[model samples]
Target: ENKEETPETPETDSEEEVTIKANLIFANGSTQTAEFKGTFEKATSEAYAYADTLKKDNGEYTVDVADKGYTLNIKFAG
Candidate 1:
C-alpha cells in the first residue's frame, strides 16, 4: 500500500533584528553615522566600528568616546 507524504512547515528566522541608528559626533565639527539591523550588542558594535573608521590614524587610539571628546549615540526600537 502507498501512503501520501505530509508537507513540512517552513521555519522562520527566530533572531529578528530591528533597524538601528547610530550617530558619532566629533569635536572637529564633523559627524559619522551607521545604520543597520542587529541586536543591542551587535548594534553597539557597529557604532564602535564606524567610530574606529572615522578616527583610525597613526599612533595609538582608544575606543572610548568620552576620552576622545566624541559622542556616540545609538537609537533603535526598544
Candidate 2:
C-alpha cells in the first residue's frame, strides 16, 4: 500500500491512585498511623522514611504496610 502512517494515542489516565494504610508502633508505648494515597513503591518507601525519622528514639521500630505482600520490620540502634 502507499506510504501512510498514523500515530497512536496513549491513555493519559493510565496511572491509578494507590491507597494504603500505614500502622506504626513505637517503643515508647505509643504509635502513629495514617492512610497514604500514592504509588505502591512510594507509599511503602515514604512510610519507611517516615519511620526512620523516629530512629532518634534510640530503640527498635517496625513498619508494616500492605503492598503486594511486602513487609518490613526493622530494629534501630542508638
Candidate 3:
C-alpha cells in the first residue's frame, strides 16, 4: 500500500475543541470542583501524581499539549 511520508492535513474548517459541561466532585468528598475549577479526569489525575513533576512515558501522553497559562506536563507510561 502507498503511504505519504507524513500525515496529511485536512483542508477544511473545524472547531478546535468541542466543549462539554458536567457537574464535578471533589477530592475531599466535600467541596465540588465547580466551586472553583473543573474536575480532573483519570488521565489528568494520574498526570498530577507524577514524581518531581516528570512525565510518565518520557513525554508522549495523548493529552500532550502546550504548557501555557498554568498548564500541566503529561506523558505516556512505559
| CA RMSD, predictions in order | 10.6, 9.0, 15.6
Pairs that clash in candidate 2? none
Q: Which runs of model 3 end up more than 4 angstroms from their true locations?
A: 1-40, 52-71, 74-78
The 0-to-1 C-alpha lDDT of every candidate, in the order given, reads 0.50, 0.57, 0.33
Among all candidates shown, the one with the greatest lDDT:
2
User: Candidate 3 has what TM-score?
Assistant: 0.18
Q: Give all TM-scores, in the order shown.
A: 0.42, 0.51, 0.18
Q: Write candidate 2's Cα lDDT for 1-78 as tens digits.
A: 678567456565434566655555555656556555667667677767766776776674645433464444443434
Compared with the true structure, what per-residue lDDT tens digits does model 1 show for residues 1-78?
977776455376534555555565555455555666556456657766665565534232334333233333621211
lDDT of 2: 0.57
Model 2: per-residue Cα lDDT at residue 33: 62
| Descending-lDDT candidate ranking | 2, 1, 3
In order of TM-score, best first, we have 2, 1, 3
Over the stretch 25-74, how does candidate 3's per-residue lDDT look in tens digits? 22334322111123334334433443224332344333333433223333
Residue 4 of model 1 has an lDDT of 75
Q: Where is model 2 more than 4 Å wrong at Cα?
A: 1-16, 65-78
